[PDB]
Design a protein around this nucleic acid. Structure first.
Ligand SMILES: [Mg+2]
Ligand SMILES: [Mg+2]
Ligand SMILES: [Mg+2]
Ligand SMILES: [Mg+2]
Ligand SMILES: [Mg+2]
Ligand SMILES: [Mg+2]
Ligand SMILES: [Mg+2]
Ligand SMILES: [Mg+2]
Ligand SMILES: [Mg+2]
Ligand SMILES: [Mg+2]
Ligand SMILES: [Mg+2]
Ligand SMILES: [Mg+2]
Ligand SMILES: [Mg+2]
Ligand SMILES: [Mg+2]
Ligand SMILES: [Mg+2]
Ligand SMILES: [Mg+2]
Ligand SMILES: [Mg+2]
Ligand SMILES: [Mg+2]
Ligand SMILES: [Mg+2]
Ligand SMILES: [Mg+2]
Ligand SMILES: [Mg+2]
Ligand SMILES: [Mg+2]
Ligand SMILES: [Mg+2]
Ligand SMILES: [Mg+2]
Ligand SMILES: [Mg+2]
Ligand SMILES: [Mg+2]
Ligand SMILES: [Mg+2]
Ligand SMILES: [Mg+2]
Ligand SMILES: [Mg+2]
Ligand SMILES: [Mg+2]
Ligand SMILES: [Mg+2]
Ligand SMILES: [Mg+2]
Ligand SMILES: [Mg+2]
Ligand SMILES: [Mg+2]
Ligand SMILES: [Mg+2]
Ligand SMILES: [Mg+2]
Ligand SMILES: [Mg+2]
Ligand SMILES: [Mg+2]
Ligand SMILES: [Mg+2]
Ligand SMILES: [Mg+2]
Ligand SMILES: [Mg+2]
Ligand SMILES: [Mg+2]
Ligand SMILES: [Mg+2]
Ligand SMILES: [Mg+2]
Ligand SMILES: [Mg+2]
Ligand SMILES: [Mg+2]
Ligand SMILES: [Mg+2]
Ligand SMILES: [Mg+2]
Ligand SMILES: [Mg+2]
Ligand SMILES: [Mg+2]
Lengths: 53, 124, 53, 210, 147, 124
RNA sequence: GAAAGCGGGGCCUCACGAUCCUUCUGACCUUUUGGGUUUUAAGCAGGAGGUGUCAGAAAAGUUACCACAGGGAUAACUGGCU
RNA sequence: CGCUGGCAGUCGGCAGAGCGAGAAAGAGAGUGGCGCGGACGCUACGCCGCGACGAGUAGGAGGGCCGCUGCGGUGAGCCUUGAAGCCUAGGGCGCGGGCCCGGGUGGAGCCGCCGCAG
RNA sequence: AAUGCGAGUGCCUAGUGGGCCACUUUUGGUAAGCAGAACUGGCGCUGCGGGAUGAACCGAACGCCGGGUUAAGGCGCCCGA
RNA sequence: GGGGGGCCACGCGUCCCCCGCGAGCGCACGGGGUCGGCGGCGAUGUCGGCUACCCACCCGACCCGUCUUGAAACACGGACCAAGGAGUCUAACACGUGCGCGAGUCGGGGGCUACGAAAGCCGCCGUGGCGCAAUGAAGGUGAAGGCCGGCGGCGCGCCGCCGGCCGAGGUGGGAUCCCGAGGCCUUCCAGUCCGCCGAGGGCGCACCACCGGCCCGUCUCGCCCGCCGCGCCGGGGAGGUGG
RNA sequence: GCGUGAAACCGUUAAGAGGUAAACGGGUGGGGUCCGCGCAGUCCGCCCGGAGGAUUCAACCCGGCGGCGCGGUCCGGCCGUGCCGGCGGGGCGGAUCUCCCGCUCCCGUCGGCGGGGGACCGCCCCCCGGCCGGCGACCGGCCGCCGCCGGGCGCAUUUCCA
RNA sequence: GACCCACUCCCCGGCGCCGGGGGGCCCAAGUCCUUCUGAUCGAGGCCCAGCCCGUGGACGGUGUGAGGCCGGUAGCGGCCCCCGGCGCGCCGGGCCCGGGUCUUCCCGGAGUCGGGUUGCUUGGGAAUGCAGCCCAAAGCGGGUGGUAAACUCCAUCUAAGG
């Protein structure tokens, strides 16, 4: 969508501090598990070592 | 092609409905305002349409606006526009067949001698 | 979606194919619901043919 | 046997190509080796620039590229002589020299001379003896701010001269470009035979007088 | 993905999709482009007309760089400069005409295919075609030659 | 949206079991424990869960409040019903019908609450 | 032929031949490479020189000293039909 | 296989429970003369309803919650209170490929689901 | 005009390119379970009922079953009648 | 038309030719089965188990693979069992399909900054490839026009020459969309809004058929226009034809 | 030559069978081996009747929490792939234009060009006012209604339990 | 050679001194309580220091399956030797040096280039390269300028030494 909420920054003790950051527009991008799978299963082959007899 | 297919008389103030992609065409200078529904609109076509002052809808927005698709003009791209269709039809090397052959490259000595010249052999 | 990426050369967030994705709220909206026919939810199973003779 | 429709392909796999196969599995290994060698060289020449000597402004030949400009191999001896730099001392202060280059033009020559002057203005020269300064070298306040340059020295950038929208004049509206191209092509093609025919016309008509 | 291939569905079938009568022999018609004159002549003439023979003059030391002449049509003439170059001349009242250098954009010859908007231009080009210069003169403009 | 994340979780969720020609869900708020859009306990804005109490007796009814949707710590409100077998069946039915809180799960909640009370009885 | 008309071979159904190469003819023709002139050479277009195994490899035997892949698609025995 | 069939209407005390019927179209708005109640459903890649049809070599296509091995994720998975493997006049499921339990043997690792690879 | 049926169109494409038999027409041959054609149907690729047996004949083509009825054939016994 | 049995015939009040809601109650040849009907046996010998172990009987039933027109063949391979065992990988091309961007697209080579030899980034690193322009052997060339006014020439039209305005073709079929003659009932007519249908009429997507138009090569017929070099110069027109 | 110890093949025990070689498909029958841990036979909901037992129902009071709110338009916030304004401040980009500065031709004068401003335009960010619209991918306080929980009061013709 | 301007510091070898590589040794925390086993490294627990350490939860061994039993691992962690680089001072040596404008002089690789022919080779096509034989040079010369040859201009290098 287009509505970007106001996320709260938490302190190291677990409680909320006074700082608020608006939600980045990255988190409203479309969810495409097919493209994530296509990118993952093609980029995961790039760290492979060759094997041969 | 969208401008010419919506410039026709009678179809003013209508929604052009595209199932494919609305791409920009840069050999045109004036863009009138257009109410657009498409699956995808390219980034430079979107800028030109919104600067012209029209609206760009998606298909859920079109379903909310006109559930029965009233006041709409369905449009589609040229289906024979692809390069694949020049190699289709009657075979090359046959009388009255302007079918593009499959060559590794084009040039002087790439399939231009025996089936093409009246001097060397024959011409179809 | 209106400001491009500053640390990349030319990258924008991708466009949404479908803005409102909650098709339940889309379908039970009065805009869509008035332009529908009556639902034919009556089940008509097969009839055992008795001989009229 | 050929299928219905397709290309006539000529694969060059008729020799023993499987013996001479070059795989690139050591490409990320040679990139790290080149990077480590580059950084070791950059630490070896500590205030000197990492790219090396300065390369001159050079036009490209062979009409596909004659509008672009490029980094050449070295400054020519004419350029160094106009700039006032000795050819056996220029290589000691990071000026790349090759003696093969000629200078057909004047504009590229003076551009490379200006290139040498602006680099000479930017050169911070350390004394040969660190404990005692010399005559033609930088002062002590510049040596402590002297750093190492990253990337090519004075990078070469293609500039285009911007021109105003001018009001078109009546004689520019009368210029026939295609007619000029065709007549210039014809006059280049027919120059020799016209001169030979004029020579024959002057040779046949001078026989009449004698 | 070998699991998606045809071979995995051909286990148990004897001829492996290749026929009982006509077996999958090694090269039953020759290797490569064999028999273009003799027994593949019908395919070579019905699909590759002109493949055999000599046409034209030879050029021994041909380098592609001498005949380098990229072309641009006049329907792409206004895309080489910015949009505020074009609209400033439209709002302009003194009749000044912007200059388009196609050699800077990487084109040598200007051909004239599409329309031009009714506003003056000064096109600098290495070569011009006749309809290209007449469509510039008709809209009102200059065709400057450069070398 | 709920439909959008259902299209992600319909086949590759960690709560999904597919064996013996059946499918289920081990989701915390999935009453009837089956994999479906209607009964999924995490994609919806208003969910109802019926679980046994921490000790031997009672039925805990869990709802999801509308305010904190991205805040799962304070999202779910929990109530404990340690009463007889009939007033809890009236109470949960009231909590769903009178509040109009996701009303197509009322008989599923009652059928789960009856099963928990039957399970908390002494065995024979 | 007065003309209507007829005729671009034989009253009709046969009398014949690709690529590569060579040879001749045709143009105030193109290229011959950094340019110019002139020979030469390469092109473009139309005929010919020929493949009769006639959609066109350049090609003599013998093997009882024999060899291989095959064939009952094919002979020399029997058995069958006649 | 076809009907490119039907179901988002589970529209509930902010309620009124329907679209099988021979005949293009609205159970339309306005303007003047006590008892707190109502089964199932809907993995929409799901569920349901009508018809018609079912041979197969060579061959082609689709579906496999058929099977083997390894990898990325995931089952707060299984396991010396007994894993893999093997045997079985035991109980079963699936049209089938195959699979799950029971008994015995054995002594240390193994499997289900979503994808990937051979 | 009658009868009946939803059609039109574009890509990619395996296997095959040894066939054989029968009513009728028909060539060579004394003839052949011989050699060679035309048309249609089969066998090949196909099980089932009958011709005792059976590539091709007669009937009839096939998902797993229950009831009924038939085709071609049959109904002394083998062997249903 | 006049003077005993079956009829899906049973109103009143007119004009006139022929002379829009009654309630109830049960029965059932009525949108596919029920009983609001019963009886026997069952703890050391009996109940159920189709499948699986063995055996018996009736009917059926030749050993598989392969080549072949035809195999059970007096055609070849095969005693039996376990393990291994045969359409793979790279390159190239075509077509279809999925994704991203889109007249652009792509960093594959290079460079920057445990898993990680991964991932990220470069844009004046997009060089370069492919696509955006074809055609000719090549020199080369290189993809709408029409109307009007004025001037010059030819003898009212044409050509050439300067200014204005209109402007990317048409015919047929064409999913979809637009208008709407009239109408979709509840006591009766006018009567506005929201919908729904519809005679007829239109703009017509993609795609197909056709007729035109434009670019390059070539052929034929021809008359003109340009100037820095007036020429074996350059440019144009009409009609076929090859791509 | 000793983990696990399959099949082919063999020995023995047990069971069954045996003159058309064995084996097989369909249909039953008989005998075994084990299993159902069979052998008096399913429970579930409502209502009625009979024997009992609770610290018990409805309605009120207090406190907490949740839902909804066209609170026609309550107060305050946040967002907008929303729109206009400004005696507003800023960053990127532009083939829109133009005081000092290097160097260059001709006498500190005088012209072209390399280089930072400056102006213009587009977009974005942050401050200001206005509406619009959202808070169902994104809410807080009072108020109103409803629901639930806990604790009181209920002393049992109510409610619940076997 | 003359006229002017400008250099007082380059290299190596020893003497002695100043801050990467190889080797050796070592550095955290449970064998804590119940419990299964033939043996535990299994299971349960260890409160409010959420058992203890963690820059160490890689691996291996130890009577199954161990971060905490042990070797190890982490750490710009430590300690002890050896070698080398990077520098400074000193001694004994060398070297006794340049740039610019005029003036006068000088300057090049031969049985090689190249030509014919033969054979191999190349994409190199009237001969790309190599080699044998024959001929055999020139000095405003010679080679190259991807079609053989003549004339005439241009452009570009300087072969047959390293
Ligand atoms: Mg084939
Ligand atoms: Mg098959
Ligand atoms: Mg085979
Ligand atoms: Mg195949
Ligand atoms: Mg074959
Ligand atoms: Mg093959
Ligand atoms: Mg032949
Ligand atoms: Mg004629
Ligand atoms: Mg005659
Ligand atoms: Mg003999
Ligand atoms: Mg003989
Ligand atoms: Mg042999
Ligand atoms: Mg035979
Ligand atoms: Mg015989
Ligand atoms: Mg079938
Ligand atoms: Mg067994
Ligand atoms: Mg064959
Ligand atoms: Mg015959
Ligand atoms: Mg058939
Ligand atoms: Mg048959
Ligand atoms: Mg008989
Ligand atoms: Mg029957
Ligand atoms: Mg009989
Ligand atoms: Mg029998
Ligand atoms: Mg065989
Ligand atoms: Mg045979
Ligand atoms: Mg066959
Ligand atoms: Mg057989
Ligand atoms: Mg026999
Ligand atoms: Mg054989
Ligand atoms: Mg044998
Ligand atoms: Mg095996
Ligand atoms: Mg594709
Ligand atoms: Mg062991
Ligand atoms: Mg053993
Ligand atoms: Mg016995
Ligand atoms: Mg261990
Ligand atoms: Mg423990
Ligand atoms: Mg360990
Ligand atoms: Mg521990
Ligand atoms: Mg330790
Ligand atoms: Mg340690
Ligand atoms: Mg260490
Ligand atoms: Mg030599
Ligand atoms: Mg050799
Ligand atoms: Mg060779
Ligand atoms: Mg020359
Ligand atoms: Mg030449
Ligand atoms: Mg040398
Ligand atoms: Mg040399």
């Amino acid at each position: 969508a287009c509505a970007r909420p106001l996320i709260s920054v938490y302190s190291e003790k677990g409680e909320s501090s006074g700082k608020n950051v608006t939600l980045p527009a990255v988190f409203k991008a479309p969810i495409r598990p097919d493209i994530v799978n296509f990118v993952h299963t093609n980029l995961r082959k790039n760290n492979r070592q060759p094997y041969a007899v | 092609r969208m401008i010419r297919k919506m410039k026709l008389p009678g179809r003013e103030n209508k929604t052009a409905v595209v199932v494919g992609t609305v791409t920009d065409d840069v050999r045109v200078q004036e863009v009138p305002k257009l109410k657009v529904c498409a699956l995808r609109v390219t980034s430079r076509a979107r800028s030109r349409i919104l600067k012209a002052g029209g609206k760009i809808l998606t298909f859920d927005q079109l379903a909310l606006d006109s559930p029965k698709g009233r006041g709409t003009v369905l449009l589609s791209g040229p289906r024979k526009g692809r390069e694949v269709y020049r190699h289709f039809g009657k075979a090359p090397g046959t009388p009255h067949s302007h079918t593009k052959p499959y060559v590794r490259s084009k040039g002087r000595k790439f399939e231009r001698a025996r089936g093409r010249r009246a001097s060397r052999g024959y011409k179809n | 979606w209106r400001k491009a990426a500053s640390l990349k050369s030319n990258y924008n967030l991708p466009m949404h194919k479908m803005l409102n994705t909650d098709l339940s709220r889309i379908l039970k909206s009065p805009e869509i619901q008035r332009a529908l026919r009556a639902p034919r939810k009556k089940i008509h199973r097969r009839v055992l043919k008795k001989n009229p003779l | 046997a050929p299928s219905r429709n397709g290309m006539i392909l000529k694969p060059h796999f008729h020799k023993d190509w499987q013996r001479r196969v070059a795989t690139w599995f050591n490409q990320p290994a040679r990139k790290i080796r080149r990077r480590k060698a580059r950084q070791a060289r950059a630490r070896r020449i500590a205030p000197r620039p990492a790219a090396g000597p300065i390369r001159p402004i050079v036009r490209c030949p062979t009409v596909r590229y004659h509008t672009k400009v490029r980094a050449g191999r070295g400054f020519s001896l004419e350029e160094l002589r106009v700039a006032g730099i000795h050819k056996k001392v220029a290589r000691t202060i990071g000026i790349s020299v090759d003696p093969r280059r000629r200078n057909k033009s004047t504009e590229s020559l003076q551009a490379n001379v200006q290139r040498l002057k602006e680099y000479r203005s930017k050169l911070v020269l350390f004394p040969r003896k660190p404990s005692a300064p010399k005559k033609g070298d930088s002062s002590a306040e510049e040596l402590k701010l002297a750093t190492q340059l990253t990337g090519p020295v004075m990078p070469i950038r293609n500039v285009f001269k911007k021109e105003k929208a001018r009001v078109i004049t009546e004689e520019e509206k009368n210029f026939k470009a295609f007619a000029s191209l065709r007549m210039a092509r014809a006059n280049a093609r027919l120059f020799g035979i016209r001169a030979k025919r004029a020579k024959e016309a002057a040779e046949q008509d001078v026989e009449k007088k004698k | 993905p070998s699991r998606l291939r045809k071979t995995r569905k051909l286990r148990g079938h004897v001829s492996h999709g290749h026929g009982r009568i006509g077996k999958h022999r090694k090269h039953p018609g020759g290797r490569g482009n064999a028999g273009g004159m003799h027994h593949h002549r019908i395919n070579f003439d019905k699909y590759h007309p002109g493949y055999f023979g000599k046409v034209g003059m030879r050029h021994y030391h041909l380098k592609r760089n001498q005949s380098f002449c990229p072309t641009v049509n006049l329907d792409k003439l206004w895309t080489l400069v910015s949009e505020q170059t074009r609209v400033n001349a439209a709002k302009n009242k003194t009749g000044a005409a912007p200059i388009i250098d196609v050699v800077r954009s990487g084109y040598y010859k200007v051909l004239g295919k599409g329309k031009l908007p009714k506003q003056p231009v000064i096109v600098k080009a290495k070569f011009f075609s006749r309809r290209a210069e007449e469509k510039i003169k008709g809209v009102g403009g200059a065709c400057v030659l450069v070398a | 949206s709920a439909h959008l994340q259902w299209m992600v979780v319909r086949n590759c969720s960690s709560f999904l079991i597919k064996r013996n020609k059946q499918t289920y869900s081990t989701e915390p708020n999935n009453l009837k424990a089956r994999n479906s859009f209607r009964y999924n306990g995490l994609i919806h804005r208003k969910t109802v869960g019926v679980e046994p109490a921490a000790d031997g007796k009672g039925v805990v009814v869990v709802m999801k409040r509308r305010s904190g949707q991205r805040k799962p710590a304070t999202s779910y409100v929990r109530t404990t019903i340690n009463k007889n077998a009939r007033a809890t069946l009236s109470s949960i039915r009231h909590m769903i019908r009178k509040n109009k809180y996701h009303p197509d799960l009322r008989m599923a909640a009652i059928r789960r609450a009856s099963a928990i009370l039957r399970s908390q009885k002494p065995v024979m």
